[PDB]
Amino acid sequence: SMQEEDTFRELRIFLRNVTHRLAIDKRFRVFTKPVDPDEVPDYVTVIKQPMDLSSVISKIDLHKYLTVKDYLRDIDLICSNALEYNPDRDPGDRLIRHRACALRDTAYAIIKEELDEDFEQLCEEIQESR
Ligand SMILES: CNC(=O)[C@H](CCCCNC(C)=O)NC(C)=O
Ligand SMILES: [Cl-]
């Protein structure tokens, strides 16, 4: 329906705004663009599902997220990819893990404070009904 389309449009607007807020945070700059396969030729071979905030924006715009849950699965990937690719005790790896996982945590915290659970519930019900 029209109303269902309106619902998904509001979802997109909400997700773009959350994503923008993460993207403008200085700590998160390394996650704003895909890893360049110049600097990092092994990345694309170790990490099977690369994810970054610019890809998140593309996916929003292509209508790939129909619920906040599906968006958070991609946010989770940003964290878990960093944990997996940068597991070492050295400070360079520790800083990327800290920042990737602070991204996760910040996205969760914004959503906990600002997403209405009945709005999420509606998105899930429309998605399921397809
Ligand atoms: C081939 N490896 C490199 O180029 C690495 C840098 C990779 C950092 C990993 N990025 C992410 C976003 O997880 N080297 C140096 C200098 O840290
Ligand atoms: Cl830095």
CSV table of all heavy atoms in Angstrom, one decimal, residues 55-99:
chain,number,residue,atom,x,y,z
A,55,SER,N,28.6,2.3,2.2
A,55,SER,CA,27.8,1.2,1.7
A,55,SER,C,26.5,1.1,2.4
A,55,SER,O,25.5,0.7,1.8
A,55,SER,CB,28.6,-0.2,1.8
A,55,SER,OG,29.7,-0.1,1.0
A,56,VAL,N,26.5,1.4,3.7
A,56,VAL,CA,25.2,1.4,4.4
A,56,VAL,C,24.3,2.4,3.8
A,56,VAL,O,23.1,2.1,3.6
A,56,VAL,CB,25.4,1.6,6.0
A,56,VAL,CG1,24.1,1.9,6.7
A,56,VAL,CG2,26.1,0.4,6.5
A,57,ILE,N,24.8,3.7,3.5
A,57,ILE,CA,24.0,4.7,2.9
A,57,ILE,C,23.5,4.2,1.5
A,57,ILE,O,22.3,4.3,1.2
A,57,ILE,CB,24.7,6.0,2.7
A,57,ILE,CG1,25.1,6.7,4.0
A,57,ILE,CG2,23.9,7.0,1.8
A,57,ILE,CD1,23.8,7.2,4.8
A,58,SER,N,24.3,3.5,0.7
A,58,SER,CA,23.9,3.0,-0.6
A,58,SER,C,22.7,2.0,-0.4
A,58,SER,O,21.7,2.0,-1.2
A,58,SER,CB,25.0,2.3,-1.3
A,58,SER,OG,25.9,3.3,-1.6
A,59,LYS,N,22.9,1.1,0.6
A,59,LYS,CA,21.8,0.1,0.9
A,59,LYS,C,20.5,0.7,1.3
A,59,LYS,O,19.4,0.3,0.9
A,59,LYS,CB,22.3,-1.0,1.8
A,59,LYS,CG,23.4,-1.9,1.2
A,59,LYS,CD,23.9,-2.9,2.1
A,59,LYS,CE,22.8,-3.9,2.3
A,59,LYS,NZ,23.3,-5.1,3.1
A,60,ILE,N,20.7,1.8,2.1
A,60,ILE,CA,19.4,2.4,2.5
A,60,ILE,C,18.7,2.9,1.3
A,60,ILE,O,17.5,2.7,1.1
A,60,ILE,CB,19.7,3.6,3.5
A,60,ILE,CG1,20.2,3.1,4.8
A,60,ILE,CG2,18.4,4.4,3.6
A,60,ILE,CD1,20.8,4.2,5.7
A,61,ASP,N,19.4,3.7,0.4
A,61,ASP,CA,18.9,4.3,-0.8
A,61,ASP,C,18.4,3.3,-1.8
A,61,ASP,O,17.5,3.6,-2.6
A,61,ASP,CB,19.9,5.2,-1.4
A,61,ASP,CG,20.2,6.5,-0.6
A,61,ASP,OD1,19.4,6.7,0.3
A,61,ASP,OD2,21.2,7.2,-0.8
A,62,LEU,N,18.9,2.0,-1.8
A,62,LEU,CA,18.4,1.0,-2.7
A,62,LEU,C,17.3,0.2,-2.1
A,62,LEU,O,16.9,-0.8,-2.6
A,62,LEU,CB,19.6,0.0,-3.0
A,62,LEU,CG,20.6,0.6,-3.9
A,62,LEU,CD1,21.9,-0.3,-3.9
A,62,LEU,CD2,20.1,0.8,-5.4
A,63,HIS,N,16.8,0.7,-0.9
A,63,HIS,CA,15.6,0.1,-0.2
A,63,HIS,C,16.0,-1.3,0.2
A,63,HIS,O,15.1,-2.2,0.4
A,63,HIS,CB,14.3,0.1,-1.1
A,63,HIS,CG,13.9,1.5,-1.5
A,63,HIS,ND1,12.6,1.7,-1.9
A,63,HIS,CD2,14.5,2.6,-1.4
A,63,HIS,CE1,12.5,3.0,-2.2
A,63,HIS,NE2,13.7,3.6,-1.9
A,64,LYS,N,17.2,-1.6,0.6
A,64,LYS,CA,17.6,-2.9,1.1
A,64,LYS,C,17.2,-3.2,2.5
A,64,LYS,O,17.2,-4.3,2.9
A,64,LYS,CB,19.0,-3.2,0.9
A,64,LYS,CG,19.6,-3.1,-0.5
A,64,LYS,CD,19.1,-4.2,-1.4
A,64,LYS,CE,19.9,-4.2,-2.7
A,64,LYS,NZ,20.1,-5.6,-3.1
A,65,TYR,N,17.0,-2.1,3.4
A,65,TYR,CA,16.7,-2.4,4.7
A,65,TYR,C,15.2,-2.2,4.9
A,65,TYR,O,14.7,-1.1,4.7
A,65,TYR,CB,17.4,-1.4,5.7
A,65,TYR,CG,18.9,-1.5,5.6
A,65,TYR,CD1,19.6,-0.4,5.2
A,65,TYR,CD2,19.6,-2.7,5.9
A,65,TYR,CE1,21.0,-0.4,5.1
A,65,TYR,CE2,21.0,-2.7,5.7
A,65,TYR,CZ,21.7,-1.6,5.4
A,65,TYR,OH,23.1,-1.6,5.3
A,66,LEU,N,14.5,-3.2,5.3
A,66,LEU,CA,13.0,-3.1,5.6
A,66,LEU,C,12.8,-3.0,7.1
A,66,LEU,O,11.6,-2.8,7.5
A,66,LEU,CB,12.2,-4.2,5.0
A,66,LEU,CG,12.3,-4.4,3.5
A,66,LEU,CD1,11.1,-5.3,3.0
A,66,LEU,CD2,12.3,-3.1,2.7
A,67,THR,N,13.8,-3.2,8.0
A,67,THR,CA,13.6,-3.1,9.4
A,67,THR,C,14.9,-2.6,10.0
A,67,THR,O,15.9,-2.6,9.4
A,67,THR,CB,13.4,-4.5,10.1
A,67,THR,OG1,14.6,-5.3,9.9
A,67,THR,CG2,12.2,-5.3,9.6
A,68,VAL,N,14.8,-2.1,11.3
A,68,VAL,CA,16.0,-1.6,11.9
A,68,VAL,C,16.9,-2.8,12.3
A,68,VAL,O,18.1,-2.7,12.3
A,68,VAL,CB,15.6,-0.8,13.2
A,68,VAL,CG1,16.9,-0.3,13.9
A,68,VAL,CG2,14.9,0.5,12.8
A,69,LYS,N,16.3,-4.0,12.5
A,69,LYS,CA,17.0,-5.1,12.7
A,69,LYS,C,18.0,-5.5,11.6
A,69,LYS,O,19.2,-5.8,11.9
A,69,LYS,CB,16.1,-6.3,13.2
A,69,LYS,CG,16.7,-7.6,13.3
A,69,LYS,CD,15.7,-8.6,14.0
A,69,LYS,CE,15.0,-8.0,15.2
A,69,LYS,NZ,14.5,-9.0,16.2
A,70,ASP,N,17.6,-5.4,10.3
A,70,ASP,CA,18.4,-5.7,9.2
A,70,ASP,C,19.6,-4.7,9.1
A,70,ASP,O,20.6,-5.0,8.7
A,70,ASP,CB,17.6,-5.8,7.9
A,70,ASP,CG,16.7,-7.0,7.9
A,70,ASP,OD1,17.0,-7.9,8.7
A,70,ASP,OD2,15.9,-7.0,7.1
A,71,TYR,N,19.3,-3.4,9.4
A,71,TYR,CA,20.3,-2.4,9.4
A,71,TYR,C,21.4,-2.7,10.5
A,71,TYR,O,22.6,-2.6,10.2
A,71,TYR,CB,19.6,-1.0,9.7
A,71,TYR,CG,20.5,0.2,10.0
A,71,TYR,CD1,21.1,0.9,9.0
A,71,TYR,CD2,20.8,0.5,11.3
A,71,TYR,CE1,21.9,2.0,9.3
A,71,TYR,CE2,21.6,1.6,11.6
A,71,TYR,CZ,22.2,2.3,10.6
A,71,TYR,OH,22.9,3.5,10.8
A,72,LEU,N,20.9,-3.0,11.7
A,72,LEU,CA,21.9,-3.3,12.7
A,72,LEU,C,22.7,-4.5,12.4
A,72,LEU,O,23.9,-4.6,13.0
A,72,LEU,CB,21.2,-3.5,14.1
A,72,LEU,CG,20.7,-2.1,14.7
A,72,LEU,CD1,19.8,-2.4,15.9
A,72,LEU,CD2,21.8,-1.1,14.9
A,73,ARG,N,22.2,-5.4,11.6
A,73,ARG,CA,23.1,-6.6,11.2
A,73,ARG,C,24.3,-6.1,10.4
A,73,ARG,O,25.4,-6.7,10.6
A,73,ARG,CB,22.4,-7.6,10.4
A,73,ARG,CG,21.5,-8.5,11.2
A,73,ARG,CD,20.9,-9.6,10.3
A,73,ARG,NE,19.5,-9.7,10.4
A,73,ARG,CZ,18.8,-10.3,11.4
A,73,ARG,NH1,19.4,-10.8,12.5
A,73,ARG,NH2,17.5,-10.4,11.4
A,74,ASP,N,24.1,-5.0,9.6
A,74,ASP,CA,25.3,-4.5,8.9
A,74,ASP,C,26.2,-3.7,9.8
A,74,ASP,O,27.4,-3.7,9.7
A,74,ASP,CB,24.8,-3.7,7.7
A,74,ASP,CG,24.4,-4.6,6.5
A,74,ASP,OD1,24.7,-5.8,6.6
A,74,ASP,OD2,24.0,-4.0,5.4
A,75,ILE,N,25.6,-2.9,10.7
A,75,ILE,CA,26.4,-2.2,11.7
A,75,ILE,C,27.2,-3.3,12.5
A,75,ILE,O,28.4,-3.1,12.7
A,75,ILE,CB,25.5,-1.4,12.7
A,75,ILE,CG1,24.8,-0.3,11.9
A,75,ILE,CG2,26.4,-0.8,13.8
A,75,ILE,CD1,25.6,0.8,11.2
A,76,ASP,N,26.6,-4.3,13.0
A,76,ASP,CA,27.3,-5.4,13.6
A,76,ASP,C,28.5,-5.9,12.8
A,76,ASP,O,29.6,-6.2,13.4
A,76,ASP,CB,26.5,-6.6,14.0
A,76,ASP,CG,25.4,-6.4,15.0
A,76,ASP,OD1,25.5,-5.6,15.9
A,76,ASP,OD2,24.4,-7.2,15.0
A,77,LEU,N,28.4,-5.9,11.5
A,77,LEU,CA,29.5,-6.5,10.6
A,77,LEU,C,30.7,-5.5,10.7
A,77,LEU,O,31.8,-5.9,10.6
A,77,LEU,CB,29.0,-6.4,9.2
A,77,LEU,CG,28.4,-7.7,8.6
A,77,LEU,CD1,28.1,-7.4,7.1
A,77,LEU,CD2,29.5,-8.8,8.7
A,78,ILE,N,30.4,-4.2,10.8
A,78,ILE,CA,31.5,-3.3,10.9
A,78,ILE,C,32.4,-3.6,12.1
A,78,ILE,O,33.6,-3.6,11.9
A,78,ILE,CB,31.0,-1.8,10.8
A,78,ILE,CG1,30.4,-1.5,9.5
A,78,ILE,CG2,32.1,-0.9,11.3
A,78,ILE,CD1,29.6,-0.1,9.4
A,79,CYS,N,31.7,-3.9,13.2
A,79,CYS,CA,32.4,-4.3,14.4
A,79,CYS,C,33.1,-5.7,14.3
A,79,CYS,O,34.3,-5.8,14.5
A,79,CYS,CB,31.5,-4.2,15.7
A,79,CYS,SG,32.1,-4.9,17.3
A,80,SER,N,32.3,-6.7,13.8
A,80,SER,CA,32.9,-8.0,13.8
A,80,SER,C,34.0,-8.1,12.8
A,80,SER,O,35.0,-8.9,13.0
A,80,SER,CB,31.8,-9.1,13.7
A,80,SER,OG,31.2,-8.9,12.4
A,81,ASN,N,33.9,-7.5,11.6
A,81,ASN,CA,34.9,-7.5,10.6
A,81,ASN,C,36.2,-6.9,11.3
A,81,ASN,O,37.3,-7.4,11.0
A,81,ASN,CB,34.6,-6.6,9.4
A,81,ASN,CG,33.6,-7.3,8.5
A,81,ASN,OD1,33.3,-8.5,8.7
A,81,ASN,ND2,33.1,-6.6,7.5
A,82,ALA,N,36.1,-5.8,12.0
A,82,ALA,CA,37.3,-5.2,12.7
A,82,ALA,C,37.9,-6.2,13.7
A,82,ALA,O,39.1,-6.3,13.7
A,82,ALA,CB,36.9,-3.9,13.3
A,83,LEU,N,37.0,-6.9,14.5
A,83,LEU,CA,37.5,-7.8,15.5
A,83,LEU,C,38.3,-8.9,14.8
A,83,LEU,O,39.3,-9.4,15.3
A,83,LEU,CB,36.4,-8.4,16.3
A,83,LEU,CG,35.6,-7.5,17.1
A,83,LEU,CD1,34.6,-8.2,18.0
A,83,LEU,CD2,36.5,-6.6,18.0
A,84,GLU,N,37.8,-9.3,13.6
A,84,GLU,CA,38.4,-10.4,12.9
A,84,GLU,C,39.7,-10.0,12.2
A,84,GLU,O,40.7,-10.8,12.2
A,84,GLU,CB,37.4,-11.1,11.9
A,84,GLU,CG,38.1,-12.3,11.2
A,84,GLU,CD,37.3,-13.1,10.2
A,84,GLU,OE1,36.1,-12.7,10.0
A,84,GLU,OE2,37.8,-14.1,9.6
A,85,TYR,N,39.7,-8.9,11.5
A,85,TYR,CA,40.8,-8.5,10.7
A,85,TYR,C,41.9,-8.0,11.6
A,85,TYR,O,43.1,-8.0,11.2
A,85,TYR,CB,40.5,-7.5,9.6
A,85,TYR,CG,41.6,-7.3,8.6
A,85,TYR,CD1,42.0,-8.3,7.7
A,85,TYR,CD2,42.3,-6.1,8.6
A,85,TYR,CE1,43.0,-8.1,6.8
A,85,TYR,CE2,43.3,-5.9,7.7
A,85,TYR,CZ,43.7,-6.9,6.8
A,85,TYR,OH,44.7,-6.7,5.9
A,86,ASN,N,41.6,-7.4,12.7
A,86,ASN,CA,42.6,-6.7,13.5
A,86,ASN,C,42.6,-7.3,14.9
A,86,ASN,O,42.1,-6.6,15.9
A,86,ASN,CB,42.3,-5.2,13.6
A,86,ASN,CG,42.1,-4.5,12.2
A,86,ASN,OD1,43.1,-4.1,11.5
A,86,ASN,ND2,40.9,-4.4,11.7
A,87,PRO,N,43.0,-8.5,15.1
A,87,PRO,CA,42.8,-9.2,16.4
A,87,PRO,C,44.1,-9.0,17.3
A,87,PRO,O,44.0,-9.5,18.4
A,87,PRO,CB,42.8,-10.7,16.0
A,87,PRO,CG,43.7,-10.8,14.8
A,87,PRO,CD,43.5,-9.5,14.1
A,88,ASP,N,45.1,-8.3,16.8
A,88,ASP,CA,46.4,-8.4,17.6
A,88,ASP,C,46.4,-7.5,18.8
A,88,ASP,O,45.6,-6.6,18.9
A,88,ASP,CB,47.6,-8.2,16.7
A,88,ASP,CG,47.7,-9.4,15.7
A,88,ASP,OD1,47.1,-10.5,16.0
A,88,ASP,OD2,48.2,-9.2,14.6
A,89,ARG,N,47.4,-7.7,19.7
A,89,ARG,CA,47.5,-6.9,20.9
A,89,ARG,C,48.1,-5.5,20.6
A,89,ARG,O,48.1,-4.7,21.5
A,89,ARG,CB,48.1,-7.6,22.2
A,89,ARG,CG,49.6,-7.8,22.1
A,89,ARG,CD,50.5,-6.7,22.6
A,89,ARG,NE,50.1,-6.1,23.9
A,89,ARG,CZ,50.4,-4.9,24.3
A,89,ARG,NH1,51.0,-4.1,23.4
A,89,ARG,NH2,49.9,-4.4,25.4
A,90,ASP,N,48.6,-5.3,19.4
A,90,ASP,CA,49.3,-4.0,19.3
A,90,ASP,C,48.3,-2.9,19.2
A,90,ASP,O,47.1,-3.0,19.0
A,90,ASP,CB,50.1,-4.0,18.0
A,90,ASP,CG,49.3,-4.1,16.8
A,90,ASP,OD1,49.0,-5.3,16.5
A,90,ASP,OD2,48.8,-3.1,16.2
A,91,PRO,N,48.8,-1.6,19.6
A,91,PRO,CA,47.9,-0.5,19.7
A,91,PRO,C,47.0,-0.2,18.4
A,91,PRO,O,46.0,0.4,18.6
A,91,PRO,CB,48.8,0.7,20.1
A,91,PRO,CG,50.0,0.0,20.7
A,91,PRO,CD,50.2,-1.3,19.9
A,92,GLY,N,47.6,-0.4,17.2
A,92,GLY,CA,47.0,-0.1,16.0
A,92,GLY,C,45.7,-0.9,15.9
A,92,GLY,O,44.7,-0.3,15.6
A,93,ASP,N,45.8,-2.2,16.1
A,93,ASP,CA,44.7,-3.1,16.1
A,93,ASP,C,43.7,-2.8,17.2
A,93,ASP,O,42.5,-2.9,17.1
A,93,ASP,CB,45.2,-4.6,16.2
A,93,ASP,CG,45.6,-5.2,14.9
A,93,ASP,OD1,45.9,-4.4,13.9
A,93,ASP,OD2,45.6,-6.5,14.8
A,94,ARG,N,44.3,-2.6,18.4
A,94,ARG,CA,43.4,-2.3,19.5
A,94,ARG,C,42.6,-1.1,19.2
A,94,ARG,O,41.4,-1.0,19.7
A,94,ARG,CB,44.1,-2.2,20.9
A,94,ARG,CG,44.5,-3.6,21.5
A,94,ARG,CD,45.2,-3.5,22.8
A,94,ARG,NE,45.2,-4.8,23.4
A,94,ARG,CZ,46.2,-5.3,24.2
A,94,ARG,NH1,47.3,-4.6,24.4
A,94,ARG,NH2,46.2,-6.5,24.8
A,95,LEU,N,43.2,-0.1,18.6
A,95,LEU,CA,42.4,1.2,18.5
A,95,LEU,C,41.3,1.0,17.5
A,95,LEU,O,40.2,1.5,17.7
A,95,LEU,CB,43.4,2.2,17.9
A,95,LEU,CG,42.8,3.6,17.6
A,95,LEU,CD1,42.1,4.2,18.8
A,95,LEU,CD2,43.8,4.5,17.0
A,96,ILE,N,41.5,0.2,16.4
A,96,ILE,CA,40.5,0.0,15.3
A,96,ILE,C,39.4,-0.8,15.9
A,96,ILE,O,38.2,-0.5,15.7
A,96,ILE,CB,41.1,-0.6,14.1
A,96,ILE,CG1,42.3,0.1,13.5
A,96,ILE,CG2,40.0,-0.7,13.0
A,96,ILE,CD1,43.2,-0.6,12.5
A,97,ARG,N,39.7,-1.9,16.7
A,97,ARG,CA,38.6,-2.6,17.4
A,97,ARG,C,37.8,-1.8,18.3
A,97,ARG,O,36.6,-1.9,18.5
A,97,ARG,CB,39.2,-3.8,18.2
A,97,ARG,CG,40.0,-4.8,17.3
A,97,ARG,CD,40.0,-6.0,18.3
A,97,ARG,NE,40.7,-6.1,19.5
A,97,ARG,CZ,42.1,-6.2,19.7
A,97,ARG,NH1,42.9,-6.2,18.6
A,97,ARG,NH2,42.6,-6.3,20.9
A,98,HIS,N,38.5,-0.9,19.1
A,98,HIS,CA,37.8,-0.1,20.1
A,98,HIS,C,36.9,0.8,19.3
A,98,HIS,O,35.7,1.0,19.8
A,98,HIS,CB,38.8,0.7,21.0
A,98,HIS,CG,38.2,1.3,22.2
A,98,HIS,ND1,37.7,2.6,22.2
A,98,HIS,CD2,37.8,0.7,23.4
A,98,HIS,CE1,37.1,2.8,23.3
A,98,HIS,NE2,37.2,1.7,24.1
A,99,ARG,N,37.3,1.4,18.2
A,99,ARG,CA,36.5,2.4,17.5
A,99,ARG,C,35.4,1.7,16.7
A,99,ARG,O,34.3,2.2,16.7
A,99,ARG,CB,37.4,3.1,16.5
A,99,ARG,CG,38.3,4.2,17.1
A,99,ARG,CD,39.3,4.5,16.0
A,99,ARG,NE,39.9,5.7,16.4
A,99,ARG,CZ,40.9,6.3,15.7
A,99,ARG,NH1,41.3,5.9,14.5
A,99,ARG,NH2,41.3,7.5,16.2
